[PDB]
């Protein structure tokens, strides 16, 4: 989506519902994870892809569910399968978890507004 929380406005930390209509194309974002159970997170959103256009997602979001399927404790492959096979309309519940995400990316941290910074 377009930028909404500007400057040092805090990024909302409650869960949100995002509905992406992508037909039979990719969603246009990457997911990262480790074990099962530590969370599936958005690491990257492709410029001009369906998530960028049709959705309101950001790097650092945890994917809580896809089309009502709970992914909070999913394995990485099964989360990828769930997303790829979700169909043309994809309803994601996401929640911004930048502290957890920041542990994946080198020299990264969370600033006072909740933004992920990489030095």
């Amino acid at each position: 989506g377009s930028p909404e929380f500007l400057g040092e406005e805090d990024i909302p930390r409650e869960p949100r519902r995002i509905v992406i209509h992508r037909g039979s194309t990719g969603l246009g974002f990457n997911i990262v994870g480790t074990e099962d159970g530590e969370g599936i997170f958005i690491s990257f959103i492709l410029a001009g892809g369906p998530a960028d256009l049709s959705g309101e997602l950001r790097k650092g979001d945890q994917i809580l569910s896809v089309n009502g399927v709970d992914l909070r404790n999913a394995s990485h492959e099964q989360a990828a399968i769930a997303l790829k096979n979700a169909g043309q309309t994809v309803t994601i519940i996401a929640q911004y978890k930048p502290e957890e995400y920041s542990r994946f990316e080198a020299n990264s941290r969370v600033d006072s507004s909740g933004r992920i910074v990489t030095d």
Partner: peptide, 8 residues
């Protein structure tokens, strides 16, 4: 470590 990344 045991880290994985995938495009969807």
């Amino acid at each position: 470590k045991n880290y994985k990344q995938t495009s969807v």
